[PDB]
Design a protein around this ligand. Structure first.
Ligand SMILES: CC1(C)S[C@H]([C@H](NC(=O)[C@H](N)c2ccccc2)C(=O)O)N[C@H]1C(=O)O
Ligand SMILES: [Mn+2]
Ligand SMILES: [Mn+2]
Ligand SMILES: [Mn+2]
Length: 241
């Protein structure tokens, strides 16, 4: 078993594949987990999603590294055996965009918030090949998200970072909050170094309101949780103002 310093531990049902862990969340949704070994600190787990949409697969977030991301693609090849149509990455930090090069090498179309793409070079990341833009209420402009199938992308406002986006999985009760949302028992909001402390609470609540019927909330650094992850995150964020 992989036993990270930060992130959910392994439980029955989890599948180890190389350096990664996969968990099935729904008949057509899996969580991918990759681990950054921080020298002297141990492993930091990061989670994304894999969604089957008929004869194709859609990915949310890379792994920390290109090699780990290539392993995700290998797992998809083995277990699903369908092509990856596109990937969405949820902001311009290593845990979410560290593996862009592996996606590009594989010929997978990549999408991110326009702002994430603009920040990427300043964060030592490679930009996605396509930019998503958003309405004044946070919903993605549909023309910028062509053929996204069940992925419903929502920009909740600045929180964990100014560019953080979130993704609901239509046809399921799952929504993905990325690094914006922390678990219902969290002691902290993680790294606030790039955070908007004024708007964080409202942004967390906006995510909840965008996907009001989602009962399983997936996030970057803990196991899937209830909507209490959203409300607890917002309550922690209320204290920052
Ligand atoms: C897990 C984190 C505390 S670190 C990660 C991210 N940081 C990185 O991706 C850095 N490249 C990094 C540097 C040293 C050790 C780990 C990550 C961030 O600052 O939001 N996301 C944070 C978070 O989601 O709260
Ligand atoms: Mn981050
Ligand atoms: Mn993170
Ligand atoms: Mn402001």
């Amino acid at each position: 078993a992989i036993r990270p310093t930060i992130g959910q531990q392994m439980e029955t049902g989890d599948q180890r594949f190389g350096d990664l862990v996969f968990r099935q969340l729904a008949p057509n949704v899996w969580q991918h987990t990759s681990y950054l070994d921080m020298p002297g600190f141990g492993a930091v787990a990061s989670n994304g999603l894999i969604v089957r949409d008929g004869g194709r697969v859609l990915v949310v977030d890379t792994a920390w590294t290109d090699d780990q991301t290539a392993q995700i693609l290998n797992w998809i090849k083995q277990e699903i055996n369908l092509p990856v149509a596109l990937a969405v990455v949820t902001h311009a930090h290593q845990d979410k965009m560290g593996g862009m090069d592996a996606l590009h090498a594989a010929g997978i179309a990549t999408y991110a918030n326009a702002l994430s793409n603009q920040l990427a070079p300043q964060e030592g990341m490679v930009a996605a090949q396509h930019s998503l833009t958003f309405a004044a209420n946070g919903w993605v402009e549909p023309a910028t998200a062509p053929n996204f199938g069940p992925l419903k992308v929502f920009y909740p406002g600045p929180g964990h970072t100014s560019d953080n986006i979130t993704v609901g999985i239509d046809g399921t009760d799952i929504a993905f909050g990325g690094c914006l949302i922390k678990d219902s028992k969290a002691k902290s909001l993680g790294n606030l170094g790039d955070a908007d402390t004024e708007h964080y609470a409202a942004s967390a609540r906006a995510f909840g309101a965008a996907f009001p019927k989602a009962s399983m909330i997936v996030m970057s650094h803990s196991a899937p949780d209830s909507r209490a992850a959203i409300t607890h995150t917002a309550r922690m964020a209320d204290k920052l103002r």
